[PDB]
Amino acid sequence: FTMKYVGSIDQGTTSTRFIIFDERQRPVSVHQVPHTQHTPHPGWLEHDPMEIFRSACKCMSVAIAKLRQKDASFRKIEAIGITNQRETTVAWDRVTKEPLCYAPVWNDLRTYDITKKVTAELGGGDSMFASKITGLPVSTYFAAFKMRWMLENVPAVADACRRGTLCFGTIDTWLMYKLSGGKAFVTDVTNASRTFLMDLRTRKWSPELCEKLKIPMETLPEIRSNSELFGYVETDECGVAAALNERTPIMGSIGDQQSALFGNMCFEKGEAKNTYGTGCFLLMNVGEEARFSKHGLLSTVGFQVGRDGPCYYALEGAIACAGATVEWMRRNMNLFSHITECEKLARSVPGTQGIVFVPAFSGLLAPYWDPSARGTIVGMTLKTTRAHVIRAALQAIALQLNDVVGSMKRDAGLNLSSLRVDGGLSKNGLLMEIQASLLGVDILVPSMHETTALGAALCAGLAAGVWTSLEEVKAVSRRENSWKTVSPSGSAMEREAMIAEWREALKRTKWAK
Amino acid sequence: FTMKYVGSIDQGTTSTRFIIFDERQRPVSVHQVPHTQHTPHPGWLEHDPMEIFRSACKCMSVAIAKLRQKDASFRKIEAIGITNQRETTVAWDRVTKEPLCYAPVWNDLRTYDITKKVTAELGGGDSMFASKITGLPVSTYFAAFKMRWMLENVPAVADACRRGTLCFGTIDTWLMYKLSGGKAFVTDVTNASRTFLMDLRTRKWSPELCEKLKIPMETLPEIRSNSELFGYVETDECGVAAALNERTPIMGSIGDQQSALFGNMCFEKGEAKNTYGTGCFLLMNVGEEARFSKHGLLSTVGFQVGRDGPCYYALEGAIACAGATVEWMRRNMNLFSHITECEKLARSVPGTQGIVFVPAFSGLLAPYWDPSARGTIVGMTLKTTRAHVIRAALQAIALQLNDVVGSMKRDAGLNLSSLRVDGGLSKNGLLMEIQASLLGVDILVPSMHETTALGAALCAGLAAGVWTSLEEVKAVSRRENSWKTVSPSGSAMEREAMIAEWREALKRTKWAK
Ligand SMILES: O=[N+]([O-])c1ccc(OP(=O)(O)O)cc1
């Protein structure tokens, strides 16, 4: 007769949150705790993994306490799910159970040398040399290269290898270990697919790649699915085992972007979501068979519910961040003071009237991957004003979105039936409209924006029988969490012409070096 | 003897001033009357010649009246100089003593069709066909075309020519005619060199060009030098004769840009001035023989002191968007509000850190005439701020002058000796510093910034024997009216880098259509 509840640890780049969902998929208690963004050298970023673990734990205790106040009958959480910033890589010790050093983060660039050394000496100049095993190019992001760095550069890690005590893992594995008090060394397929060490289609580790990249398989955890028993919460770090009252299984684990994909109900092929945040990503569910990319996209696991469940696959494109760009204009250029001005300034003109603004501040991502491109504005006259500039920026973000979707259609051989939006600037109507116009499809916007956290809880709830199937999940959602829907409103010669402007502008972005 | 004074009528585009100078060259009295800007169609601008005449007479009597009140040694004006907006052309009747229409202004675009006709039907498509005679390209600015336009399109002008009663003249000629009572019908070599009817080398009306453009040599006045007896003031309009008290000679006449060149003492070859106004006009003194441009620059007369005395020639170049760029950043982009904030913001960063801001809003004038070039910013990152964008705008202005100056050096076979500056933007200390650094010459900023008015006052005063030579003229200024100097303060590698970024950036400006 009382509510069943599922727990979600959302371990992000800048903070950690615990969200408790009820069986109707509503966030009923939340707590958030930030952690320190250590940047020792230009271009490095690094996290304290004990800080992360303690944050996770504080979030669970405070969230649990806040719910108890709201619902005094609630005795236990059915299960806990983990979603996490991917690729960020932790090194720890099997016996001390303690980190050997700080965790270099997804967008950290200390792995640059090692990246060229790998392309050159292991894959003769082709970045895409192992893209049929991993689904990925050689890039600074991926875990194996951070792993490599910490073996070369960090004495205690180099040391711990010798002794057979060295564990490596992405943040899912790290949290999941420490929560288990040391008893669990596992990872899920979505996180593993970002190591550069896993085979995309088998979802097993690749001895070819470990051997080549010089990573002892002893260090690596057991790959499992996203939805199944990973272990139990058995730490009393900030009272957590106490607050949970019963022993609580961890039955969900999944990378943030996939988790947003899962939690926005993109279960069918052609369904896709655009997430905002510390980084911005478009993922498309492409179906049961992997799709590789000739147009600079990543091939990756969408989700796999259960060991024997079918594996859904995805293509992934990183774009510009509406948010970063908007904040830059406000805080660096002073083109407005508060975010409400932004949309009105953009709305106050009927177009860019000639200008294009390519916000390639740290290179061009998406189907272009040009790290020499820098932020550029073209076409300005004495009549141009900050309204045009702000507008052009929002157009620019829709435009890379479109080139990325273009690339996805080609690689995947499918259409994008719908785009779901989530992360902050899904709340800008004008942007949602231009996106809607340019892609020629609908843009869904949930009123329960909390969908990244939800994915992991759905994973954990499915596994534990809170919800019974993907069908029930979808139904409860349709029934409980409402969803605004933005429809296209463009010509074709508008679309063709705005893109034509865009094409010419990109030619003028090459700057660095 | 007693104290001597010289008056200067500074007849500009938006207002007329009268400045009385004392023999130490200090402005001791000023009055300024504006006049109406008639814009009968887009791109057209014209002026009321009798309103301008009345403004000049008002300014004279008020400035005089004000001076008697504050200076008991001021008995009379020894001579009057006239400086004027060039190219603006007035048509009047020898017997009614009055205009037959309003006066098309220098930047008036009604002459467009006529100049296309002239380029094809007389140049075979080469706008430079008569540049070796005139020093000038075919353009809407120059007076013959405005003369042609009024002949063709203003029935009263056509008629007056037929009766033999039509007078054409640039503003100097008109002012000197009406002040004369209708006696003097004269022009000075600097004004005449902007007509497209003068042979640069001889300084005579070219019978061929008058014949070819079908402008009759009977409509034109006598070309004299800048400094000599032109006539006397013989009107009592707005009480001017009663105020002058004693009969007063007119002994100086000089086009505004050349007047600023003279007033800044640029008497030797290699000496130049730049007015930093809305746009920039740079003039270099190239010496005693004409020099023709192979970089699109204008060849003109600099000055001529005394009838048939030595005649110094100049090269002239513009930029369109100097102060307009500061202003644009203020009103269109909100990068700042008060005008003091501009220099403050630009100093707050050590440099542009990668970015170039090419402010070619109305296109590139200067030695790379390109109307397809538009406003563009390259090089931006998330570290970029309005401070950087502002500093880059200062650098841009300085980089164009550099390019302009570079072309003058090539055209003349001379080094830039030094650059004297005036205009509002010369008060921007950082811009002058950046400019000295790039040109590797001293920049001279006069504290008495009334340099246009002074040029004409000096011409009149030399001719009247208030000052006896140019050496004396220089001596008094160096002594009395103190100059600030700004020396180069940068490395040759910072110079060469900034110019290399500038040249790279210029290749990205092509946009319009
Ligand atoms: O540089 N200009 O374009 C420009 C030049 C002169 C103007 O008017 P003035 O200052 O009264 O002569 C106004 C604008």
* A376: chain B residues, CB-CB within 8 Å: 376-380, 508
Rounded distance between C-alpha atoms, residue A509 and residue B362, angstroms: 22
Rounded distance between C-alpha atoms, residue A265 and residue B424, angstroms: 63
Rounded distance between C-alpha atoms, residue B314 and residue B255, angstroms: 13
CA distance B391 to chain A (A): 13
CATH topology for B1-264?
Nucleotidyltransferase; domain 5 (3.30.420)
* A385: chain B residues, CB-CB within 8 Å: 332-333
Q: Which of A324, A374, A386 sits opposite B378 (nearest CB)?
A: A374
Per-residue tokens: A302? 């969408």
Q: Is the CB of B277 under 6 A from ligand 1?
A: yes
Sign of CA dihedral A160, A161, A164, A168: positive
The alpha carbon of residue B454 and the mean position of all alpha carbons in its chain are separated, in whole angstroms, by 13
The answer to whether B254 and B226 are in contact (CB under 8 A) is: yes
What is the number of other CB atoms lying within 10 angstroms of the CB of residue A68? Answer: 15
Rounded distance between C-alpha atoms, residue B137 and residue A419, angstroms: 58
SS3 B57: helix
Q: Which of B334, B385, B508 sits opposite A386 (nearest CB)?
A: B334
Rounded distance between C-alpha atoms, residue A230 and residue A176, angstroms: 8
Which residues neighbour B46 within 8 Å (Cβ) at sequence distance 6 or greater?
Answer: B38, B39, B40, B102, B103, B104, B105, B108
Q: Testing the interface with A: which of B377, B389, B502, B509 to mutate, by most A Cβ within 10 A? A: B377
Amino acid at position A111, single letter: T
- The single residue listed with the structure tokens 């005139």 is B134
Tell me the backbone φ, ψ of residue B356, rounded to 5 degrees.
Answer: -120, 140
The answer to whether A192 and A255 are in contact (CB under 8 A) is: no
Helices (H), A169-273: 171-179, 189-192, 207-213, 240-244, 256-263
Radius of gyration of chain B measured on its C-alpha atoms? 23
- Contact state of B361 with A384 under an 8 Å Cβ cutoff: yes
CA distance B440 to chain A (A): 27
What is the number of other CB atoms lying within 10 angstroms of the CB of residue B54? Answer: 18
Buried b (16+ CB within 10 A) or exposed e, A403-431: bbbbbbeebbebebebbbbbbbbbebebb
- End-to-end CA separation in angstroms for chain A: 66
Q: What's B441's DSSP letter?
A: S
Rounded distance between C-alpha atoms, residue A237 and residue A235, angstroms: 5
Rounded distance between C-alpha atoms, residue B136 and residue B143, angstroms: 12
Domain(s) of CATH 3.30.420.40: residues in chain A: 1-264, 265-513
Amino acid at position A471, single letter: E
- Residue B247 — left, alpha, or beta (φ > 0 → left; ψ -120 to 50 → alpha)? beta
Q: Please, what is the Cα angle at B183 between B182 and B187, to 5 degrees?
A: 95
Per-residue tokens: B49? 């010649």
The answer to whether A23 and A39 are in contact (CB under 8 A) is: no
Reported as type and span, the H/E element at residue A436 is helix A429-439
Q: Which of B183, B174, B267 is nearest to B455 (CA)?
A: B267
- Residue B116 — left, alpha, or beta (φ > 0 → left; ψ -120 to 50 → alpha)? alpha
The answer to whether B132 and B123 are in contact (CB under 8 A) is: no
CA-nearest residue, atom 4 of ligand 1 = B278
Q: Which of A329, A277, A233 is nearest to A18 (CA)?
A: A233
CATH topology for A265-513?
Nucleotidyltransferase; domain 5 (3.30.420)
Dmax over CA atoms of chain A, in Å, equals 69
What is the distance in A from the centroid of ligand 1 to the CA of B60? 21
Q: What's A153's DSSP letter?
A: H
Resolution in A: 2.6
- End-to-end CA separation in angstroms for chain B: 67
Experimentally, the structure was elucidated by X-ray
- Adjacent-strand bridge partners of A378: A356
Q: Which of B453, B445, B454 is nearest to B486 (CA)?
A: B445
Helix, strand and coil content of chain B, in percent to the nearest 5, comes to: 35, 25, 40
Per-residue tokens: B450? 């009334």
Q: Is the CB of B14 under 6 A from ligand 1?
A: yes
- Contact state of A378 with B382 under an 8 Å Cβ cutoff: no
Angle at which helix A339-347 crosses helix A429-439, to 10 degrees, equals 50
Tell how many helices (H) and how many strands (E) occur in chain B.
17, 24
Q: Which of B336, B382, B511 sits opposite A361 (nearest CB)?
A: B382
SS3 B407: helix
Q: Are strands B166-170 and B89-93 parallel, antiparallel or unpaired?
A: antiparallel
Rounded distance between C-alpha atoms, residue A224 and residue B165, angstroms: 103
- Contact state of A379 with B377 under an 8 Å Cβ cutoff: no
Q: Which of B324, B380, B389 sits opposite A374 (nearest CB)?
A: B380
What is the number of other CB atoms lying within 10 angstroms of the CB of residue A144? Answer: 28
SS3 A74: coil
- Contact state of B377 with A375 under an 8 Å Cβ cutoff: yes
Concatenate the DSSP letters of all residues of B117-175 into one string: HHHHHHHTT-TTTTHHHHS----SSSHHHHHHHHHHH-HHHHHHHHHT-EEEEEHHHHH
Reported as type and span, the H/E element at residue A194 is none
Angle at which helix B171-179 crosses helix B49-70, to 10 degrees, equals 60
Per-residue tokens: B266? 């640029």
Q: Is the CB of B99 under 6 A from ligand 1?
A: no
Nearest atom in ligand 1 to the alpha carbon of residue B279 is 1
Which residues neighbour A58 within 8 Å (Cβ) at sequence distance 6 or greater?
Answer: A31, A33, A238
Taking CB atoms within 8 Å and a gap of at least 24, the contacts of B439-443 are B439/B401, B439/B402, B439/B405, B439/B488, B440/B488, B440/B495, B441/B416, B441/B417, B441/B488, B442/B418, B442/B485, B442/B486, B442/B487, B442/B488, B443/B418, B443/B419, B443/B485, B443/B486, B443/B487
Rounded distance between C-alpha atoms, residue A400 and residue A456, angstroms: 29
- Contact state of B511 with A378 under an 8 Å Cβ cutoff: yes
Nearest CA in chain A to B508: A508
What is the distance in A from the centroid of ligand 1 to the CA of A312? 69
